[PDB]
Amino acid sequence: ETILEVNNVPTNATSLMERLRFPVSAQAGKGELCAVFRADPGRNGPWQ
Amino acid sequence: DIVLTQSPAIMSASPGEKVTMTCSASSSVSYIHWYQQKSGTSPKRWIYDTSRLAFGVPGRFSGSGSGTSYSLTISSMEAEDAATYYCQQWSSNYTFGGGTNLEIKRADAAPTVSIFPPSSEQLTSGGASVVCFLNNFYPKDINVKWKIDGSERQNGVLNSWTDQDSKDSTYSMSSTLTLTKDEYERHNSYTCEATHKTSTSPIVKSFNRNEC
Amino acid sequence: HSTAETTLDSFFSRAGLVGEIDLPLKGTTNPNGYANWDIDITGYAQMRRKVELFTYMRFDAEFTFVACTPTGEVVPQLLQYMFVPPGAPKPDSRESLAWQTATNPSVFVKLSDPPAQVSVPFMSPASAYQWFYDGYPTKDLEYGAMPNNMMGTFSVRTVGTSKSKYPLVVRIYMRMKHVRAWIPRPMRNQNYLFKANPNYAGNSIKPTGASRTAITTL
Amino acid sequence: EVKLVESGGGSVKPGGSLKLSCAASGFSFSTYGMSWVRQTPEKRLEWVATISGGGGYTYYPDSVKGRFTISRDNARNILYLQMSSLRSGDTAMYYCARRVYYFDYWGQGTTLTVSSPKTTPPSVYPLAPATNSMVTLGCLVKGYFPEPVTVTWNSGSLSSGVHTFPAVLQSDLYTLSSSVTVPSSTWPSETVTCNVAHPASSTKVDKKIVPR
User: Domain Picornavirus capsid VP1, which positions (chain C) (predicted)?
Assistant: First the structure.
């Protein structure tokens, strides 16, 4: 098990640790899409 | 307190040739992004993370740079690209660049000059404005002088420039000399002469006050 | 259904290029018609990161020598390849007596003769080559220096008392065999700066992989 | 489509307060951070505030931290920007942007003019000439505030040969010019008329260009 950087969006050097975790909050209403990604181990994105 | 300087401010391509705009930073920067802004419309997205292109952008646009000097390159240039391009930094205080006016180059055009005596409506109000229209010329740089009864004047001269025409790609200009009624009827001959890189001698339009 | 390809040996086989000697006639480069190459397995770019996946390793190397003139031509010239084990003195000149020290294996071959090829054992006095050493040898410049990882030097030169008549180029390939590895570790995600330490660029710290706009867009 | 459409603004006297809002459409609003950016008269771009995806954190620049406050209500997909103790340096055109960092889409902006003068209807003066086959007429519309004004020629029929020259500020009133080109077959055989509409005051004036 390795940490999957699903939240692979911030690039700002000091926010790189943020890629490791995405969040959930009260502000999000029922039904809202929290997050999404593909099952592509070898291709770019999260799996890298 | 991180400033971005863009060079040059104004540019003109043939078109069909390349275009290299530069964004230089005062301190080392991680990545740079680029926007586009045509007239009347807001900024559009163009390049991000220095070298990645937004969905729409043609493949003829490019992006590179490292450290403190980054650049947006276009090869080749086409009449549809003419806009202002801003860079932006995301490290500390989110700063924008000054932009680069990209413009279409064309064959030189001498202006079509038009002079207008003041209106017999403004004069009944204690004012007199003499107006000169230089229409459809290229390139944009121009000098125009007003010569009242053989002198020259610079006080109260208002000069306005159009953006480049979407058809023939020329610019137009208006020059207004705002005087008083008494100062107007103080002289006889008003004259605007427009000097340009097209003709050798000025283009002179004249009228004498004592005729209408 | 088979997983033979995902084994260590499978992963590290293949003879890669790890060295290239230039022996020009007129030149700034190796002016004495000879050269000394301390064995560096990082010579194959791709290598460093692959091995640095493990903390300890062990293996044998098969060396194959490819020599020709710059245009890849073959000529009637004889060559001496000398292997100086670690602890043995490398030749300082084209006439150093090291070239004749029996305890330095040497192999001779004509450019015409097919590639030279020999196997070299697990040298290290330690139980395993270790890519990482968190200490110093009994702020310092000796940090991360596990010397007992030296494989030795390869000294090459044209045979004969006089300079060779031709400009020569030797290429050294190395196949790793009989590999064993221990303690796996995080795959280098930052660019390498030095051959010695793991130091990286503290400004240019890039995210392991491709980024995207939102965590809701694909 | 992703749509950012903002509302509010106009003329405000210095010291007054105002609130701007921007309405979202066609994307899940809560999952994004949202910022405002302002553009000084078509040149300089300046970041003014961001808000986190939910309540979370707000971030401001050092020109505004203290007077502006950015907010969102994630039930109607709408940003808010209240600006208190507004100064003369706050006059500009404010865009709401979505932050994916990089700004993907920009709204079309609202315009803010912080200023102490009155609202003034413009004066329109005809520009006829006191000799060839093309006629260039004009209409000088002087001394109004604020911007903008609109110059239409015979109700749009002449749009193909019209140059509109940007308004120039002096006397803390704006002054622009507008020219139109017409074949000598049409004038003065047929009425030419420029139409000046100034919505700020709801003033609309018509000038028939009569031959001098």
Answer: 1-186
Q: Is C26 exposed, middle or buried (0-12, 13-18, 19+ CB in 10 A)?
A: exposed
Half-sphere exposure of C140 (CA within 13 A, CB side): 9
Q: Is B131 exposed, middle or buried (0-12, 13-18, 19+ CB in 10 A)?
A: buried
The answer to whether D23 touches D77, Cβ cutoff 8 Å, is yes
Using a CB–CB cutoff of 8 Å, tell me whether D129 touches chain B.
yes
Nearest residue to D50 via CA among D116, D16, D96, D84: D96
Contacts of D160 (CB under 8 A, 6+ apart): none
SS3 B47: strand
| Chain D residues with CB-CB distance to A9 below 8 A | 100
Kindly tell me the sign of the dihedral angle through the C-alpha atoms of B28, B34, B38, B40: negative
Q: Is A41 on the interface with D (CB under 8 A)?
A: no
Give the span between the Cα atoms of D74 and D52, in whole angstroms: 12
Give the 3-state DSSP-derived string for chain D, with helices as H, strands as E and coil as C.
Answer: CCEEEEECCEEECCCCCEEEEEEEECCCHHHCEEEEEEECCCCCEEEEEEECCCCCCEECCCCCECCEEEEEECCCCEEEEEECCCCHHHCEEEEEEEECCCEEEECCCEEEEECCCCCECCEEEEECCCCCCEEEEEEEEEEEECCCCEEEEHHHCCHHHEEEEEEEECCCCEEEEEEEEEECCCCCCCCCEEEEEECCCCEEEEEECCCC
Residue identified by tokens 């020059």 is B175
Among D137, D131, D152, D146, which residue's Cα sits nearest to residue D196?
A: D152
Contacts of B94 in chain D (CB under 8 A): 47, 61
Q: How was this structure determined?
A: cryo-EM
Strand order in the sheet with B157-161: B112-116, B127-137, B171-180, B157-161
Cβ atoms of C141 and C25 within 8 Å: the answer is no
Tokens of C138: 């009994």
Q: Which two tokens stand for residue D28?
A: 């899940």
Please report the number of interchain residue pairs, chain B to chain C, with beta-carbon separation below 8 angstroms. Answer: 4
